[PDB]
Structure formats: C-alpha cells, structure tokens
Amino acid sequence: RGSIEIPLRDTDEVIELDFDQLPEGDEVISILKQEHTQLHIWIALALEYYKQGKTEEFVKLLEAARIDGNLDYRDHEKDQMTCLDTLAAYYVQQARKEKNKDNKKDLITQATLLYTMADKIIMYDQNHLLGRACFCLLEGDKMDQADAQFHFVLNQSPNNIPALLGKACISFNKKDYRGALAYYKKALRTNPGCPAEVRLGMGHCFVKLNKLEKARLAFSRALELNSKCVGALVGLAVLELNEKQHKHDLLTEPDLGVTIDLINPDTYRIDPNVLLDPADEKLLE
C-alpha cells in the first residue's frame, strides 16, 4: 500500500512507517516532534490517515504540525498553506454535518481563523482561494465573492476541477442552467474519474433544463458509482411525480449535493489511463 521515510535527526538513517501499519496517532506525533521532522512529512502522514478513514489522527497530526512541524527548508510557506487550508477545509466539512448549533459555530470560527492567518502567508495561493471561495458559498450572500475567486482560478488554471464545480454551482443558483451544465460537463470530460456526485449536479441541471430523460440517467450513474449517493435517490424518486419546477427547488440542497473536496489531493488527480466510460459519454452528448 505504501510507506513514508522519516529522517532521523543528526543521522544518515531513516525510519519507515508502513501505511498498513500506521501507529497510534499520538506516537507518530512524538516521533516527528523528536526528530524535528519537516512540515511536508507531517502533512503526508496526515493525509494518509485521512485516506485510511483515520480522521482524528489526521486532525491531530496537522494541528500538532502547526507547532512542531520544522520549517527549515525552501518552500516551507507552501506547506504552511496546505496545512492551514486543509485544516480549515476539514472543519468546514464537519460544520456542514454537525447538528449542535453551538458546536457548528465553533467549527466555523476555527475555519475562519485558519483562513485569515493563511491569508498572511501566501495571499493568492490557488488552493487557498479555492478554500475561501467554497467558504463564501458555505453561507452568505458572498456568492459574488465566491464567483470572483473561482473565476480568477480558471483565469490561471482553466481545467481546475474544484473551480469548475464551484462555477457550476453558482451558475445554477443564478439559474443559468445551460452554463451550470456546461461547467459540470467540462469537469467530467476533463477528469473522467471524478466523484459520483458530479453527475448528481448534472442531474439537477438536466431537470431544470427540461431534459427529464438524461436527468434520470445522470442520477442513475451516480448511484452506480456510489450506491450511498442520496440526493440522487431523492432525484430519481421525484421523477415519479410530473409551476412544476418548484417541487424540484426544495429537494435540491444549495451545493446541489456536490461537495467540492479540498482535503484529499487525489479526488481529482487525472490518471491519463482512465477513459470516459460509456454511461458518462451518453450524458455528455
């Protein structure tokens, strides 16, 4: 599955951690602290815990790295941005799910303070702006502000999947659903391996754009790729029942069920081998 090398300080040796053998989160931290490990390694370990579903290990690694992650290397700043923006992004995703109103407000505060201090390191780091953009969507009428940040990212990186998904969502909420569908379609064409929820959001465009048919094929492709996908079950199970447009207004979450993943750098990595599979190729016509 993989391993990571931890340079032992004042030595030419190294200790390997096997990812299938991931130690207790708390002892890893004392190791990286003891060997004054550079920040970039702390982050690598933390994301691996995130991938293995070991979430509190991931949180505690990166919070610890803010104190004892060594910065004695060129481009450490970019790693501080990754560390702060990934902490912030995670707290936001906990905030959406959390039901204690008081607890949720604390998560938001933590994300706010993290983004504010990441502002003072690399003001315009692409990932950072994607974080602030999605954070604008989280709540406000910061829709215009989020739109400007997403749009600026595509004026540097036209194929950036998070920015396209962000533009699609904003397009939909201002009810330009041809534009929202185009954005979603470009996301999926560009990165055939993208999350199942991309077709979910295409579904909702395919519903408001009165193309009821592919709307169902979109929702179905989502459940095929992740049978847990709920807003698509909701989606299909309201194609049952024939303005008409409104009943489809309030089953749709504001993020149209499409969460933009700012934590796992893999979610939109583009393997040149993965090819468009015909069920998506039909939705793209």
Residue numbers in the entry: 3 to 244, 1067 to 1109
Reported in the publication:
However, we succeeded in obtaining crystals of the single polypeptide created by the fusion of CTR9(1–249) to the N-terminus of PAF1(57–116) with a tobacco etch virus (TEV)-cleavable segment. The crystal structure of CTR9(1–249)–PAF1(57–116) was determined at a resolution of 2.53 Å and with one molecule per asymmetric unit. In the final model, all residues were clearly visible, except residues 1–2 and 246–249 of CTR9(1–249) and residues 57–66 and 110–116 of PAF1(57–116), presumably owing to conformation flexibility. The structure of CTR9(1–249) was composed of 12 α-helices and two β-strands at the N-terminus. The helices α1A to α5B contained five sequential helix-turn-helix repeats that exhibited structural similarity to TPR. Like multiple other TPR motifs, the five TPR units of CTR9(1–249) were arranged in parallel with adjacent α-helices to each other to create a right-handed superhelix. Region I was mainly maintained through four conserved hydrophobic amino acids (L80, V82, I84, and L86) in PAF1 and corresponding amino acids in CTR9 by hydrophobic interaction. Region II was mainly mediated by two types of interactions between amino acid pairs from PAF1 and CTR9, respectively: hydrogen bond in D90/K53 pair and hydrophobic interactions (such as P89, T91, T92, I94, and V98 in PAF1 and corresponding amino acids in CTR9). The binding of Region III was largely mediated through hydrogen bonds by several pairs of amino acids between PAF1 and CTR9: D104/R201, D104/R223, and K106/K216, which formed an extensive network of hydrogen bonds. More, in the co-IP assays, it was clear that the I87M and E109K mutations of PAF1 and the P164S, R201C, and A220T mutations of CTR9 totally abolished the interaction between CTR9(1–249) and PAF1(57–116).
